[PDB]
Design an enzyme around this catalytic site. Structure first.
Site, mmCIF file in Angstrom:
data_model
loop_
_atom_site.group_PDB
_atom_site.id
_atom_site.type_symbol
_atom_site.label_atom_id
_atom_site.label_comp_id
_atom_site.label_asym_id
_atom_site.label_seq_id
_atom_site.Cartn_x
_atom_site.Cartn_y
_atom_site.Cartn_z
ATOM 1 N N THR A 39 0.840 -1.184 0.000
ATOM 2 C CA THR A 39 0.000 0.000 0.000
ATOM 3 C C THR A 39 0.880 1.239 0.000
ATOM 4 O O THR A 39 2.061 1.194 0.356
ATOM 5 C CB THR A 39 -0.937 0.020 1.212
ATOM 6 N N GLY A 43 -2.048 4.521 -3.959
ATOM 7 C CA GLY A 43 -2.393 3.263 -4.584
ATOM 8 C C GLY A 43 -2.023 2.076 -3.722
ATOM 9 O O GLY A 43 -1.522 2.207 -2.601
ATOM 10 N N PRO A 112 5.983 -14.480 -7.260
ATOM 11 C CA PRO A 112 5.725 -14.907 -5.871
ATOM 12 C C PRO A 112 6.950 -14.959 -4.979
ATOM 13 O O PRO A 112 6.802 -15.119 -3.762
ATOM 14 C CB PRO A 112 5.084 -16.289 -6.034
ATOM 15 N N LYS A 156 15.831 0.535 -6.186
ATOM 16 C CA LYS A 156 15.974 0.247 -4.765
ATOM 17 C C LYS A 156 15.589 -1.216 -4.569
ATOM 18 O O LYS A 156 14.917 -1.787 -5.419
ATOM 19 C CB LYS A 156 15.085 1.165 -3.910
ATOM 20 N N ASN A 159 12.008 -2.741 -5.216
ATOM 21 C CA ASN A 159 11.439 -2.801 -6.552
ATOM 22 C C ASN A 159 12.011 -3.918 -7.399
ATOM 23 O O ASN A 159 11.682 -4.010 -8.582
ATOM 24 C CB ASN A 159 11.607 -1.460 -7.266
ATOM 25 N N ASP A 172 7.428 -1.373 -10.634
ATOM 26 C CA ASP A 172 7.131 0.008 -10.255
ATOM 27 C C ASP A 172 7.810 0.972 -11.213
ATOM 28 O O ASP A 172 8.968 1.353 -11.021
ATOM 29 C CB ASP A 172 7.487 0.325 -8.798
#
Ligand SMILES: O=C(O)c1ccc(C(F)(F)F)cc1
Length: 338
Positions: A39, A43, A112, A156, A159, A172
């Site tokens: 979260t 978004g 996953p 980073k 991501n 992202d």
């Protein structure tokens, strides 16, 4: 020439999709909601399952009104237009996108194995070979993105997702942008910001190569090079041109990092006349078979533990909130192109 022709085709294919973006390729009621995976202030990302095919996806849901208030309109349009146009082995793929009265949706492949960040913090630090395996994938990914005139701007550990083969998939694209020349927006995470971003300059793709230096340091040390308790202290260290290396770093690693973490962007590896090849030819990468990495033929340092494509164990737990869709269209004008 083989690399030149590869990148020429890559740019041709990107530009065709860039100029004619896909739109409205699914809708919300094609999916079941499973779990919130992350979260933020405008978004969230949810594991969903397609009701007809049974495939799992990571659905990024952006609240239009909050995107507007936080001045992220162009950034969210960038993210979707870029993602629907790119194609590379180490980028999470966008599978569908759509919007409704309240939200924007990007339906991504689900990876996953979780974030590199979790695995790094679990184990403490990666060995140099392990860090190098991941770093090579970022080098190739940035070679690809930069050849398309794209700057990524959000490197980073959070991501970088680890897939079922142990390879990286970058997620992202919220700060990614097509840039010929310079751009000016203040964005990124504090520990990864290049000096020229902190100093409010017009900056270019060299900021991604700086961030790679930060990432490599953090992977190999377990903490980032400019660590401090408050952002202002981080920024002072970043601009100072001083970095300390753990004694366990190899000399080759230290040399590469001094050239990536070069405050003077005109002297920074990745931004010199030889471009990415100063990095790829550096002695720290002497054992790297670049083609084998690209083709996914190298055995990975580790395979994340997970039970199947629906397993959420490698992500963490968040309060489960509604996905509400207003009866009235919000911000239609701002998001027409999405
Ligand atoms: O594509 C995915 O599998 C994925 C993307 C993003 C996120 C997170 F919530 F952390 F931002 C999680 C999973």
């Amino acid at each position: 020439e083989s690399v030149k022709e590869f990148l020429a085709k890559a740019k041709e294919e990107f530009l065709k999709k860039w100029e004619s973006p896909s739109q409205n390729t699914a809708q919300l009621d094609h999916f079941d909601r499973i779990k919130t995976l992350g979260t933020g202030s405008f978004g969230r990302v949810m594991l969903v399952k397609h009701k007809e095919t049974g495939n799992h996806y990571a659905m990024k849901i952006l609240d239009k009104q909050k995107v507007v208030k936080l001045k992220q309109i162009e950034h969210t349009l960038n993210e979707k237009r870029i993602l629907q146009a790119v194609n590379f082995p180490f980028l999470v793929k966008l599978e569908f996108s759509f919007k409704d009265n309240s939200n924007l949706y990007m339906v991504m492949e689900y990876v996953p194995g979780g974030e590199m960040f979790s695995h790094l913090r679990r184990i403490g630090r990666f060995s140099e070979p392990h860090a190098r395996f991941y770093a090579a994938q970022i080098v190739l990914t940035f070679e690809y993105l930069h050849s398309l005139d794209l700057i990524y701007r959000d490197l980073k550990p959070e991501n970088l997702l680890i897939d079922q083969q142990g390879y990286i998939q970058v997620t992202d694209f919220g700060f990614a942008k097509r840039v010929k020349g310079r751009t000016w927006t203040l964005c990124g995470t504090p520990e990864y910001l290049a000096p020229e971003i902190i100093l409010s300059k017009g900056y270019n793709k060299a900021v991604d190569w700086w961030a790679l230096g930060v990432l490599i340091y953090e992977m190999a040390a377990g903490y980032p090079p400019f660590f401090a308790d408050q952002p202002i202290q981080i920024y002072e260290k970043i601009v100072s041109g001083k970095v300390r290396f753990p004694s366990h770093f190899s000399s080759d690693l230290k040399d590469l990092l001094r050239n990536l973490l070069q405050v003077d962007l005109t002297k920074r590896f990745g931004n010199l006349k030889n471009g990415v090849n100063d990095i790829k030819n550096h002695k720290w990468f002497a054992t790297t078979d670049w083609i084998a990495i690209y083709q996914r033929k190298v055995e990975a340092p580790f395979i994340p533990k997970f039970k199947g494509p629906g397993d959420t164990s490698n992500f963490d737990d968040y309060e489960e909130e509604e996905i509400r869709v207003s009866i009235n269209e919000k911000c239609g004008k701002e998001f027409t192109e999405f």
